[PDB]
Amino acid sequence: HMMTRWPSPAKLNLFLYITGQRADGYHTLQTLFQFLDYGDTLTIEPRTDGQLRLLTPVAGVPDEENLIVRAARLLMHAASESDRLPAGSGADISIDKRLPMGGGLGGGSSNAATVLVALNHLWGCGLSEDELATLGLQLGADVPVFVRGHAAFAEGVGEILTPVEPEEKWYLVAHPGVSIPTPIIFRDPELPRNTPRRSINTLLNCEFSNDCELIARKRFREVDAALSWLLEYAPSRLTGTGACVFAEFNTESAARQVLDTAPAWLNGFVARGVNLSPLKQ
Amino acid sequence: MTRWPSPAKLNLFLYITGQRADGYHTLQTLFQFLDYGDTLTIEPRTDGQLRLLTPVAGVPDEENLIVRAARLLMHAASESDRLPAGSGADISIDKRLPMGGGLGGGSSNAATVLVALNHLWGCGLSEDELATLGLQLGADVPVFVRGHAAFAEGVGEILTPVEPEEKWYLVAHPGVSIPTPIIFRDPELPRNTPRRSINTLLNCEFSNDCELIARKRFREVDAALSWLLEYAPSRLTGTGACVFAEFNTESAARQVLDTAPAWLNGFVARGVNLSPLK
Ligand SMILES: Nc1ncnc2c1ncn2[C@@H]1O[C@H](COP(=O)(O)OP(=O)(O)NP(=O)(O)O)[C@@H](O)[C@H]1O
Numbered sequence A: 001h002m003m004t005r006w007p008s009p010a011k012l013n014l015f016l017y018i019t020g021q022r023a024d025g026y027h028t029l030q031t032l033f034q035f036l037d038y039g040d041t042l043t044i045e046p047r048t049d050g051q052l053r054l055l056t057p058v059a060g061v062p063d064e065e066n067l068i069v070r071a072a073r074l075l076m077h078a079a080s081e082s083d084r085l086p087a088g089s090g091a092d093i094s095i096d097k098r099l100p101m102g103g104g105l106g107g108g109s110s111n112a113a114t115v116l117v118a119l120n121h122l123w124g125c126g127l128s129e130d131e132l133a134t135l136g137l138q139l140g141a142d143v144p145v146f147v148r149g150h151a152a153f154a155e156g157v158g159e160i161l162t163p164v165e166p167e168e169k170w171y172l173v174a175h176p177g178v179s180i181p182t183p184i185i186f187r188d189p190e191l192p193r194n195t196p197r198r199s200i201n202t203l204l205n206c207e208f209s210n211d212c213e214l215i216a217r218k219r220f221r222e223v224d225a226a227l228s229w230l231l232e233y234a235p236s237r238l239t240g241t242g243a244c245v246f247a248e249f250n251t252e253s254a255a256r257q258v259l260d261t262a263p264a265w266l267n268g269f270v271a272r273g274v275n276l277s278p279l280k281q
Numbered sequence B: 001m002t003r004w005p006s007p008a009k010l011n012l013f014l015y016i017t018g019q020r021a022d023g024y025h026t027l028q029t030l031f032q033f034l035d036y037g038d039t040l041t042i043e044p045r046t047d048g049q050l051r052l053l054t055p056v057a058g059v060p061d062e063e064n065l066i067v068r069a070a071r072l073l074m075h076a077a078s079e080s081d082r083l084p085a086g087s088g089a090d091i092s093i094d095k096r097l098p099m100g101g102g103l104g105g106g107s108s109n110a111a112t113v114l115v116a117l118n119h120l121w122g123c124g125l126s127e128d129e130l131a132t133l134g135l136q137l138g139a140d141v142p143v144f145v146r147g148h149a150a151f152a153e154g155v156g157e158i159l160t161p162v163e164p165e166e167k168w169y170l171v172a173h174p175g176v177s178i179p180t181p182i183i184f185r186d187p188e189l190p191r192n193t194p195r196r197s198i199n200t201l202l203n204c205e206f207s208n209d210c211e212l213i214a215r216k217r218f219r220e221v222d223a224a225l226s227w228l229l230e231y232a233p234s235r236l237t238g239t240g241a242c243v244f245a246e247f248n249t250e251s252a253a254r255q256v257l258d259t260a261p262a263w264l265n266g267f268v269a270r271g272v273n274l275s276p277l278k
C-alpha cells in the first residue's frame, strides 16, 4: 500500500545520574534528554493480510529480536486485547539506519517509538500517547521520551517525564569505534550508584556529567581517546552508557570545524539539538 | 499506632515476557500475601531526625530499604510542600522473613514505611503516589502499597486485583541466598514467554519461569523442591531460594513441616488476598 516515511531521531543524555539500585538490579536514574536533528528514517507500508515483515534486517540483530518488530508485535497484542486492532492489520517496514548499535544515542528505543506511533496512526487503533508510552517502557528504557516527543527530565523508573527547554546547541557526536552494550556498564561493580536524588532546579544548576563516563573511559581505551580529543575544544561527555561521546558548540560552523580535527578512525557527525522531536511533526 | 505489619508475598506464578536492551526483564506475575512477616515499630519525631534503631544483619543502614523509603517519602513530600516541619521517625524492625528468598521482605518493609509515615506525618500522598514512589525502591513495593492480591504487568506498575484461593502454604528457605541478579543474568533463563490475558493465565497450570534455572544451578533448591513435591504442588517463589507447597488445611501443612530436615527452616502460613497493612 502507501509508502509512509517516519523520522526516528537520536537523543543525547545531557546529564545522567545513578541514584540507586533495586534488589532486582534495576538502577534508578535522573537524566535529561535532548533530541538531535539526526537519526534513522523508517518506511512503513501498511498491509491487510496480517503479515509483519522487516524488509531491511539490521546486521547483528535477528529479525524477531529487532525492536522494530518487537514494537509492532506488542502494539498488535495490546490493541487486539482491547478490540482496537482491525483484522488483517499488517505492515512492511524498512529502515535507513544511521544510529549505531550500543551507541548511547537511543537508536533502538527511537525506532520502537516511531513504530508504535506510526502503526497506531496508520492502523487507526486509537491508543493515546499515555498508552503508547506505557507500552514503550516495556520495550526500552527511553521509548517513552521519544513517544512523548519533548526534551525532558526523566526519573522514577523512566516513566516520570517533565518537559525541559535546554539550549538547542550544536553537537559534534563521535563514535569511538567500539560498541558498549548497557549491561556491560551497569553490571560493573565500580559504577557509581549513590548519587543523591536532586530536584530539577538543582540539577539544572549542577555541573552536567554522566555517572557512566569514568567507567567507560577506564574500561575502553577508545572512549578515553575520543574524549581526550574533543576535550581539547569544547565541553564533552559520554552519552548513555557509551560508546558515543559528544561535544557542545554554539554554532554549526564551530562544530564542523572541530569535526575536521577528528582522527580518521574517529567517525563523527554534527547535528543540532532540538527540543521537539521530528516525529511529533 | 506505632506497630505496623510487613507481610511476605508469594509469586503464585511468574512468567518472563521480554528483556530490554538495558537488561531489565518484563514479567507477568500473580501475587498473594502471607499472614506472616515482619513487625515494624515506627515512633514519630518532631526534630526532623530519622534513625533506624535496629540494624538488619549484613545491610548498611543507609542501604536499608526502611531508610531509603523514609528518605524518598521525605523528598517527594517536601518538594510538593506536604512535609510538616520537623517530620522525623525512630524505626525498629522485628525481622522474621529471610532475605534473598523471594518473599519480598525488603519490598514489604519499604511499603509499610511509606504507608505508615505518610499516615503518621499526615503528608496526604495518595495510594497512586506512594505506589509510584515505591517502584523506585523495589520491584514489588506497589503490590504491598496497594494491599490486594494482584496480577502485575508492565514494568510492575500495572496491577489488576485478583482473588486466588486462600490456601495454606508451607514455605521453605533452603538456607542458600540467591540474589535476583544471579538468576536474571543466566543465559538459559526463559525471556520470551508469550504475554497472555489474566483469564488465560488463571486457567493454565501455574509455573515459575525461574524455577528450572534455580533448580539446576542450586542443589539446595533442587533438594528442597524434590521433598515437597512428594506431598503437594510445590514451586519456587520469586527468583528463590524459597519454595512453597500448597495445602488446603493448616494441619496438613504442619504435618509435612514436622518431617522437614532442620536445614529447611520452614514455616506454615495462610494466604490472604488483603494485606494486613491495609
Ligand atoms: N532497530 C534497532 N536499532 C538499534 N538497535 C536495535 C534495534 N533492534 C534491536 N536492537 C538492539 O537493542 C538495542 C537498541 O536499544 P537503544 O535504545 O538504541 O539503546 P543504545 O543506546 O543504542 N545501546 P544499549 O542500550 O546499551 O544496548 C541495540 O543494542 C540492539 O542490539
Ligand SMILES: Nc1ncnc2c1ncn2[C@@H]1O[C@H](COP(=O)(O)OP(=O)(O)NP(=O)(O)O)[C@@H](O)[C@H]1O
Binding pocket: A023, A024, B056, B059, B063, B064, B065, B066, B098, B099, B100, B101, B102, B103, B104, B105, B106, B107, B108, B109, B138, B178, B179, B180, B181, B238, B239, B240
Ligand atoms: N529492610 C530490609 N529487609 C530485607 N532486605 C533488605 C532490607 N533493606 C535492604 N535489604 C536488602 O535488599 C533486598 C530486599 O529485597 P526483597 O524484597 O527482600 O526481595 P526478595 O523477593 O526477598 N529476593 P531478592 O530480590 O533477591 O532480594 C535484600 O536482599 C537485602 O539485602
